[PDB]
Design a protein around this nucleic acid. Structure first.
Ligand SMILES: Nc1nc2c(ncn2[C@@H]2O[C@H](COP(=O)(O)OP(=O)(O)OP(=O)(O)O)[C@@H](O)[C@H]2O)c(=O)[nH]1
Ligand SMILES: Nc1nc2c(ncn2[C@@H]2O[C@H](COP(=O)(O)OP(=O)(O)OP(=O)(O)O)[C@@H](O)[C@H]2O)c(=O)[nH]1
Ligand SMILES: [Ca+2]
Ligand SMILES: [Ca+2]
Ligand SMILES: [Mn+2]
Length: 664
RNA sequence: UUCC
């Protein structure tokens, strides 16, 4: 309770956030904007033929293939875990009130009965152990930058050249600034090395949310989505309201003269931080090496590539629970940040860098335009970083923050309800590192596989096993939250990292298999999160460089699905039905075309040799480079293919930097 | 042209 400082774009504090160039300026002023997307080149998400197709196809599947999810959120049968009404959105038009970020989430947490720090000393050691194991013996790698991404505040450059400069410069003066912040001279810090200021709110829209058909009425329903209005966000819950955004698509007709079929809605719009690159870089410089560690040494619980690779691990469990956290980001504890920095200091990380890290995690945020007639407000004074927004997504290590948190959270959920007999193994700090280390390599009778908040908890034949079953039962009755840190619960129709866990009549981690989620396929093919940006000349700077290729890796990724074959026909039909064309064909050309274009961007790729030596991963990643942020890493992607989408800095330079940072 |  304090009420955070807000400033209008006019205020000098806001002005200082955007540089004296066009891109910057325009970003500061950009107003609300919506509109159809080019789902595929030449086709609009709103084309009648298409909406019609979407309407027919979505009903037919929902009708003919109802989910096969048991009383325990385990999917069996057809692998369908929910209706296919996902696609019924006007991709391009967001739900309208689109939320404001909270200046502070303490009340939010408290009011949800979640701790304001480790509750037991054990946990305190476990969290710190996670910090220890994770930032331990890190090994330097080039700092790689996504091509065509915006440096955001204060420049907003798109230019790989300019970025590499900003970055190299950053790693250079990174220490200077920061020692500057230790002195509390946050402004000097930003003015001289543009490290600070604020995050720039960016609205990644999730093209498909819950939509249902009330048999009773005959009309559809959109899962209400709660959004906090300004007053709410500034007071952190104290005043203001928190209502549902308006997903009604009818407006589209009166506004833009677009025929909106019944049961079609505006999409859900998640918000996300555009991090000040000057700052975000010195962080990524360390983040990636950490990534490399946990993904290697602790690959059992952290590195998951294929649906068979996962299957392997879960096959040996005697119990497998698919957990679920909702609104992970806004709940993320401020104290885990401070805990972490503290441990990092103890471990011996240069202060200034830790100080950069900290600041990075309590920075103000500039809200663009959440709705028509809104925004252009900067929350939190940048001269004195003190926000508690939870976990600012743009941040260089947002994925590591989410795991360091939930991994320990989950293990603690297991220690708490199924393996008391294990506590004695966690006496001092070391014992903890030792134990956590074992747990992470998948060597205890309790096991885990995760990514930030997505995970699967397992128990092997042993003592805990009986406890496990109790926990699972608790999550089903779900009248009680099993954790003191986050609100956890069982995932109805459990799946991990995009593949669905398909049990059979036996219902055991043993005879169960993993299969790509079919709905995911449908959503990806007919409900892209971004359009094809045919405007953008350089395809490697687009959100979907090579849309067409995804067709190749399709049979592969979604092959294992039970009703696969069927779906492909339902489509073929419904498509041919509303277009006269054959979908199979469409994608086949698209594939052929894109395959050619690709060879232009890939060197070794003989300027016509086939997709020959490209791995499926390589494909889905070229059709969607965003997946390189979560589901895959530099290592699971073909060498040269990675160069297409990324560009790094001289190792000689990042290495020199990494050295000055880490514990001597 | 708006993030990891
Ligand atoms: N930088 C970034 N991270 C993202 C983005 N989307 C999801 N994430 C990552 O995903 C996590 C959020 O978990 P999700 O399951 O996607 O969503 P959520 O906000 O937790 O809650 P629900 O969507 O309601 O289940 C965070 O830890 C973020 O780091 C995005 O657009 N940008
Ligand atoms: N850093 C980051 N993490 C993400 C992003 N999207 C998802 N994640 C993380 O990865 C997990 C699985 O993400 P999902 O969106 O459920 O799965 P998916 O592989 O994209 O498959 P679909 O269901 O088809 O969208 C999440 O729990 C998040 O923590 C993203 O843009 N950035
Ligand atoms: Ca979640
Ligand atoms: Ca996703
Ligand atoms: Mn899951």
């Amino acid at each position: 309770p304090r009420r955070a400082p807000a400033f209008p774009l006019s205020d000098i504090k806001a002005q200082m956030l955007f540089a004296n160039n066009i891109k910057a300026q325009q970003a500061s002023k950009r107003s609300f904007k919506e509109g159809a997307i080019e789902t595929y080149e030449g086709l609009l998400s709103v084309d009648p033929r298409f909406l019609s197709f979407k309407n027919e196809l979505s009903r037919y599947l929902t009708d003919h293939f109802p989910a096969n999810v048991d009383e325990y959120g385990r999917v069996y049968g057809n692998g369908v875990r929910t209706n296919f009404f996902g696609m019924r959105h006007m991709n391009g038009f967001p739900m309208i009130p689109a939320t404001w970020p909270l200046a502070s989430n303490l009340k939010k947490r408290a009011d949800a009965d979640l701790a304001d720090g480790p509750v037991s000393e054990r946990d305190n050691l476990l969290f710190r152990a996670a910090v220890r194991l994770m930032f331990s013996d890190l090994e330097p790698v080039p700092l790689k930058i996504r091509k065509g991404s915006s440096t955001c505040i204060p420049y907003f450059s798109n230019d790989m050249g300019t970025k590499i400069e900003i970055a190299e410069r950053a790693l250079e003066k990174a220490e200077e600034a920061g020692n500057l912040m230790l002195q509390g001279k946050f402004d000097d810090a930003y003015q001289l090395h543009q490290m600070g200021g604020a995050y720039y709110v960016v609205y990644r829209a999730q093209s498909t949310d819950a939509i249902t058909l009330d048999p009773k009425t005959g009309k559809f329903v959109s899962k209400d989505r709660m959004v906090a209005d300004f007053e709410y966000a500034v007071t952190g819950g104290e005043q203001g309201s928190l209502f549902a955004a308006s997903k009604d698509a009818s407006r589209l007709k009166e506004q833009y003269g677009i025929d909106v079929p019944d049961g079609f809605f505006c999409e859900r719009r998640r918000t996300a931080m555009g991090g000040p690159f000057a700052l975000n870089a010195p962080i990524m410089a360390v983040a990636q090496p950490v990534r490399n560690k946990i993904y290697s040494k602790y690959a059992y619980t952290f590195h998951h590539t294929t649906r068979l690779n996962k299957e392997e691990k879960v096959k040996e469990w005697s119990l497998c629970v698919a957990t679920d956290v909702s609104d992970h980001d806004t709940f993320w504890p401020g104290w885990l940040r401070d805990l972490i920095c503290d441990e990092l200091l103890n471990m011996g990380y240069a202060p200034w860098w830790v100080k950069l890290f900290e600041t990075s995690l309590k920075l103000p945020v500039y809200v663009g335009a959440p709705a028509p007639e809104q925004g252009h407000t900067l929350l939190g004074d940048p001269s004195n970083p003190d926000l508690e927004v939870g976990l600012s997504s743009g941040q260089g290590a947002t994925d590591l923050m989410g795991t360091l948190l939930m991994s320990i959270t989950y293990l603690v959920m297991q220690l708490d309800h199924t393996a008391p007999h294990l506590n004695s193994r966690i006496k001092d700090m070391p014992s903890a590192c030792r134990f956590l280390d074992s747990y992470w390599q998948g060597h205890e009778e309790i096991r885990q596989i995760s990514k930030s908040d997505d995970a699967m908890l397992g128990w092997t034949k042993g003592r805990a096993l009986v406890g496990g079953h109790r926990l699972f039962e608790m999550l089903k009755e779900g009248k009680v939250n099993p954790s003191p840190y986050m609100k956890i619960s069982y995932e109805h129709g459990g799946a991990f990292l995009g593949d669905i866990l398909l049990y059979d009549s036996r219902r055991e981690p043993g005879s169960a298999i993993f299969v790509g989620n079919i709905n995911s396929m449908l959503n990806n093919q007919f409900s892209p999160e971004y359009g094809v940006q045919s405007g953008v000349r350089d395809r490697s700077k687009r959100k979907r460089p090579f849309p067409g290729l995804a067709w190749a890796s399709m049979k592969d990724t979604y092959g294992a699905c039970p009703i696969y074959s069927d779906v492909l026909e339902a489509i073929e039909r419904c498509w041919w039905n509303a277009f006269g064309e054959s979908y199979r064909a469409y994608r086949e050309d698209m594939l052929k075309r894109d395959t050619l274009e690709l060879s232009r961007y890939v060197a070794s790729m003989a300027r016509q040799a086939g997709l020959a030596e490209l791995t499926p991963i390589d494909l889905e990643v070229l059709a969607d480079p965003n997946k390189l942020q979560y589901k895959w890493t530099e290592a699971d992607v073909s060498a040269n293919i990675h160069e297409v989408l990324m560009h790094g800095v001289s190792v000689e330079k990042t290495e020199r930097f990494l050295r000055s940072v880490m514990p001597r």
